[PDB]
Design a binder for this molecule. Sequence first.
Ligand SMILES: O=c1ccn([C@@H]2O[C@H](COP(=O)(O)OP(=O)(O)O[C@H]3O[C@H](CO)[C@@H](O)[C@H](O)[C@H]3O)[C@@H](O)[C@H]2O)c(=O)[nH]1
Ligand SMILES: O=c1ccn([C@@H]2O[C@H](COP(=O)(O)OP(=O)(O)O[C@H]3O[C@H](CO)[C@@H](O)[C@H](O)[C@H]3O)[C@@H](O)[C@H]2O)c(=O)[nH]1
Ligand SMILES: [Cl-]
Ligand SMILES: [Cl-]
Ligand SMILES: [Cl-]
Ligand SMILES: [Cl-]
Ligand SMILES: [Cl-]
Ligand SMILES: [Cl-]
Ligand SMILES: [Cl-]
Ligand SMILES: [Cl-]
Ligand SMILES: [Cl-]
Ligand SMILES: [Cl-]
Ligand SMILES: [Cl-]
Ligand SMILES: [Cl-]
Ligand SMILES: [Mg+2]
Ligand SMILES: [Mg+2]
Ligand SMILES: [Mg+2]
Ligand SMILES: [Mg+2]
Lengths: 290, 290
Amino acid sequence: HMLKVTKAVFPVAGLGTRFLPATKASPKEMLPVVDKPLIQYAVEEAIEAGITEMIFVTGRSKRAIEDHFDKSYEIEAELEARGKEKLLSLVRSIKPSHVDCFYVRQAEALGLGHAVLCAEKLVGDNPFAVILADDLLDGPTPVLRQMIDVFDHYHASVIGVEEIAPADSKSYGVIDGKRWEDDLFKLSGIVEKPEPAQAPSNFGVVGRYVLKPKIFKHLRGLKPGAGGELQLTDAIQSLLTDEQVLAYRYDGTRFDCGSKLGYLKATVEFALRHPEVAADFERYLLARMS
Amino acid sequence: HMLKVTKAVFPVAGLGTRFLPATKASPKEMLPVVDKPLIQYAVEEAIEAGITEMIFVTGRSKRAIEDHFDKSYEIEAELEARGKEKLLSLVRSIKPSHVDCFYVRQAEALGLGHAVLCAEKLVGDNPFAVILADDLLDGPTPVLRQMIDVFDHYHASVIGVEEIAPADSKSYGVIDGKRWEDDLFKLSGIVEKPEPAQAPSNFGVVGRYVLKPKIFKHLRGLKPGAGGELQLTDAIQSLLTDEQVLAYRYDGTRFDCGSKLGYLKATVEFALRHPEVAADFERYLLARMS
Ligand SMILES: O=c1ccn([C@@H]2O[C@H](COP(=O)(O)OP(=O)(O)O[C@H]3O[C@H](CO)[C@@H](O)[C@H](O)[C@H]3O)[C@@H](O)[C@H]2O)c(=O)[nH]1
Ligand SMILES: O=c1ccn([C@@H]2O[C@H](COP(=O)(O)OP(=O)(O)O[C@H]3O[C@H](CO)[C@@H](O)[C@H](O)[C@H]3O)[C@@H](O)[C@H]2O)c(=O)[nH]1
Ligand SMILES: [Cl-]
Ligand SMILES: [Cl-]
Ligand SMILES: [Cl-]
Ligand SMILES: [Cl-]
Ligand SMILES: [Cl-]
Ligand SMILES: [Cl-]
Ligand SMILES: [Cl-]
Ligand SMILES: [Cl-]
Ligand SMILES: [Cl-]
Ligand SMILES: [Cl-]
Ligand SMILES: [Cl-]
Ligand SMILES: [Cl-]
Ligand SMILES: [Mg+2]
Ligand SMILES: [Mg+2]
Ligand SMILES: [Mg+2]
Ligand SMILES: [Mg+2]
């Protein structure tokens, strides 16, 4: 009976400088897409993939994350005294009954690899998901669900990837491997933010991972890599030196809300999806562009 | 030597239900327009109008407001250790040196009039500004500056107004008065959220006021009005029964970020104004609409 994936680690401890001043007292993963934080979309994707344990690695402004998911006595009493039963149900669904939220600190912002390592003793000897909420994903089925299906079948760590334009390679981890299926690669290498001429493929890492606990030994051995940060990507490279690691070309779509441009695109996309504002927003865009 | 206006009251203590779940642990006035909270635009408008004292009336989630404007030791040390001097200057400008931030609680969300009354003993016997940050304003000169100029000249309370469509009158306070100038009215009445057929004019109140301290006596005498809330609008009505109150048609433009639609419009407008993303965002909109 092989181990199942029931834990997800959400690093939300970066500096968020691209979104200052708004990220002064709240992480970039709390930025709202019209009315819902990025991190809530990510947790909802984990929940639909069968994850019941959410581990948040917090840095500066841990309270914005904690108070979003933890029960608020005040808000429930206020909504109940006003008979706003639909809104009350909406607020309670932020953390459904069987979902646990656990918190650990990254005191120093030393990079994504270091953030994941802070969660080591909460994950224990278990496979686990890593979800970067600034990668806002959708798909016919949740991307993490697709990836856990690959993990259960091949019993290897799985890295989510998409095709990128070569000029953007300095924004991504970039994989090097052998094709097994139309959507599946066996990795022989992975590099963080290569120059376009040094990129080994057109396949960039998106912020979804299903990792075997062996990754933690390889995170512990990291030295500073790109940008002086301890890179998860270099631990994956070290890991594939010792055991099999796969990359999965997921079925779906991505907004890079780690950049203002992508955040703007996500906002526009959300708007057209909601009938409360869709028609009116359509009309405004047409008159506004002309 | 008539009293000058140096204090501004920012009510940020509403429930913010239109933006749940994002407003679970942060008020709607903290919602970012791409990278800057609504309340920071409002405080910057006050600063440019000569206001040096910011009074925040907080409700639920007071810490999101407080930690945005109060000095953060952590973030300044982190930006300095990384030599991000421009970002450090950006963060420090959130609260320039001569600007004070004071906090008072509205324990119960009983309406805008009640929120303003909570600030009574911080304002004291002084004229003061009230600024609703969900009204995101711009203009050739700051709207509050235009209004303080009218206050200094006529020595009367001044209410900011714009022309509204008659169907929207249930979203606004609506004035009734006599024209003095192309942009100036002497009020004979004001009503909160009338039915369109009962609206006395096409001029709706926007969230900018310059008020004489006599307003506080009239706020104290309020009874529950529209929506069961203690309405600032009804105190203004009571006040104009006793002394002169003017309404000023400001020179500028408005996004009603108290609604998702207006918030969406503000985001689009901000995007086109920033050369970092403007051209790319243009192209995306055209390909996205087609
Ligand atoms: O010291 C730090 C730095 C970052 N983070 C978190 O780490 C994640 C990634 O940070 P970010 O600056 O957005 O990383 P990227 O530059 O976007 O790159 C990462 O994410 C890409 C996909 O989005 C991958 O292609 C890269 O390989 C991977 O390094 C986020 O959840 C941050 O909150 C921390 O918790 N602590
Ligand atoms: O109990 C409460 C209720 C509201 N607020 C604050 O009061 C302000 C106004 O609240 P909102 O629900 O947005 O009021 P509106 O329905 O938009 O109406 C107000 O703002 C309009 C302009 O935006 C005017 O036309 C109206 O006369 C005036 O009542 C905001 O700053 C809220 O944060 C509180 O602090 N406490
Ligand atoms: Cl970050
Ligand atoms: Cl395993
Ligand atoms: Cl390219
Ligand atoms: Cl293992
Ligand atoms: Cl994108
Ligand atoms: Cl950016
Ligand atoms: Cl509100
Ligand atoms: Cl006065
Ligand atoms: Cl109309
Ligand atoms: Cl007075
Ligand atoms: Cl608007
Ligand atoms: Cl709305
Ligand atoms: Mg980073
Ligand atoms: Mg990122
Ligand atoms: Mg209200
Ligand atoms: Mg409003």
